[PDB]
Amino acid sequence: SHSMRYFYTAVSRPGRGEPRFIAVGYVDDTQFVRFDSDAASPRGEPRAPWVEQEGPEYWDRETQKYKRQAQADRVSLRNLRGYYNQSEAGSHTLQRMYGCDLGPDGRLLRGYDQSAYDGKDYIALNEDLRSWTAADTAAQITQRKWEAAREAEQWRAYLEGTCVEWLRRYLENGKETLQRAEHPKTHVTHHPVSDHEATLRCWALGFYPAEITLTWQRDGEDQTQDTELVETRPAGDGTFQKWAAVVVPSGEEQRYTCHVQHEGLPEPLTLRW
């Protein structure tokens, strides 16, 4: 399966100028666009090669969208303070994430849209793409505005149409990277801590997509509570890293095996020191 997902953040900064608006768009775990209202000449900018080739009409159009949405979010931040009677002296955040998921058949599996104010759920498009759920009485004001605008219809048309159509186009233009999972390069390192025990660290490097499972077993049994497992982190070149470590008694290293599951592996890997 595949997804296109957008992430919008608007953050006010009282006494330090207008609120900053940032938009990022991803296919799966690959960023392909960004807009930053603080940039020297704010525009939508490509972040992946498979949209660098869309032409000036595409880019200008996206740019216009982001510039107008930044303006709107600034008004929206003021509206939200009005609903809650919050002072202009405090900073606030508006977040919105929307996108579409495709199943193995290339068909829409689900579209979504959700907003948060200061980190709390505020309003969300329902699963039927025809109505909203408001989290509190301020968001019910927003819901009645969007209902009067009949905006859910515009979400349905986008999520079931445009979002799917353009996700499929990106997947095709970028298939040599987006549809070809890069398996983790793996190894085990050993770090004695005393004459009598040592850390075994199992490494997964340079993989894509980010989803992975890394576990240590002792004699074939799981070592969950004895494994230090870092969160998956970006290498910064589009691939990811992770490691898992266990502290083992000297001489007992052969009892331990590291197990790696990743979409780029034909079959799960078992590794040893």
Binding site: A72, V75, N79, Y98, T142, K145, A149, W155, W166
Partner: peptide, 9 residues
């Protein structure tokens, strides 16, 4: 491809 401009909150 992004969503068109959305009504204000």
């Amino acid at each position: 491809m992004a969503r068109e401009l959305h009504p204000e909150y």
